[PDB]
């Protein structure tokens with residue numbers, strides 16, 4: 001069936017949209033070519049709708065069914081519990097979209113009389129009605145990027161599709177536990193969200209060394225969400241049902257599936273009807289989990305339809321990477337062809353055709369790759385890096401304009417070992433926070449879809465905990481990585497690494513002169529900037545688990 005049926009009504013903004021870098025005094029200190037940093041808006045939604053709309057075809061295999069059965073067998077190992085309205089209410093982000101029925105996220109968090117009651121009726125309703133499609137709103141996301149390599153190329157807005165607040169709270173009550181528990185049990189170590197960046201690099205590096213003759217590849221499917229068939233959503237519903245669940249939970253989950261997850265009517269911000277969705281919704285609590293289970297089911301099947309080798313996959317929603325035993329150059333290449341044919345047959349066709357790689361550092365999944373550096377003791381150390389462009393792009397925007405979720409902080413957390421995060425992002429923002437006396441101010445950032453409130457002065461403890469003390473000592477970065485950064489610094493008009501050294505010696509000096517927590521930030525985060533480096537002892541006050549358990553992208557999770 002068609003992933004989308006449109007009425008011709010337009011996907012419309014709810015708030016004025018800014019599309020250009022709101023240039024600043026401070027902003028210009030970070031980036032110069034402010035005319036290569038845009039933000040997506042409603043304007044380009046028509047384009048997105050065209051790319052994301054298409055007919056789907058699926059042809060299941062015995063390979064597919066065998067894997068489904070194993071998954072199910074494994075799923076029937078889990079016992080999930082239903083959340084109390086209190087529990088589900090607390091997990092709601094403070095800024096969450098207000099309900100069309102009078103109350104808001106603030107009321108939900110306070111357990112307001114009217115809030116809980118609407119929630120209680122949406123629940124009762126779900127239990128009584130298992131057929132009326134539930135209404136959802138469709139919006140065009142406002143994310144910023146840097147202009148496509150070639151001067152021109154812009155990204156057309158991504159589309160978010162979500163139900164009413166009251167429903168969202170109901171999703172938490174019935175599936176939150178399933179969604180942060182079942183995925184790992186079913187896919188074991190293949191479940192990507194159970195790892196912190198360091199753990200991911202360790203799993204990829206060892207899996208690569210474990211192979212006698214290693215081959216690896218990342219698979220990029222086109223509009224995964226659109227490729228998700230109604231049947232895919234029901235199959236995934238059956239996997240949740242394999243858990244030991246409460247009678248009401250099975251009922252709430254069965255209904256959410258038939259009324260919301262399988263598909264439903266789309267409504268723009270002006271209450272106008274936009275069309276109908278017969279695929280995954282980017283804005284529900286199961287988007288991430290559904291996508292990971294489904295992507296994993298197809299990829300695994302697709303592996304059997306090829307490899308006579310020892311596959312190890314890492315799956316993060318629609319992101320996939322497999323490392324197996326090479327069977328030779330021309331033979332491996334054949335295998336990926338079959339793999340792609342298999343995946344396409346399951347309604348998961350490729351954007352770019354997958355390419356056999358024989359160098360782990362050349363593989364990129366989750367827009368990241370493994371790279372090598374050295375720690376204080378000279379030892380070789382692997383860490384996860386990224387192409388700094390979007391992070392730098394979004395840092396500039398976040399300097400010039402006030403954002404609800406700020407990526408610079410999350411990038412620092414996810415990429416504390418990189419030379420760009422360490423030298424530019426850290427140096428830039430601690431400088432700003434210093435100037436404006438905002439060091440104690442908790443800020444909101446996101447990890448694996450979930451929103452968190454982090455105090456920038458904890459970065460040290462946080463980083464040692466996730467990356468280890470060595471995140472403060474890496475120094476012999478790859479000629480490759482170094483060029484990548486410098487080259488991007490060129491393109492964006494970001495001052496050279498050499499300037500960041502000086503700036504950071506300054507920032508490190510200010511932090512120190514305030515002792516306590518800022519000095520700790522100065523002592524550990526900028527030890528790289530000083531000439532005569534001083535040794536760093538395991539941070540005492542640094543001894544987070546709920547941080548890398550599961551994925552909640554599009555979900556409505558707060559912590």
Ligand SMILES: O=C(COc1ccc(Cl)cc1)Nc1ccccc1C(=O)O
Pocket residue numbers: 195196197198200366367368384386407410411412414446447448449
């Ligand atoms: O750029 C990426 C690409 O995604 C990953 C990076 C590292 C790991 Cl271990 C997994 C996904 N991630 C982020 C960057 C800043 C903040 C949050 C995130 C996130 O994935 O939650």
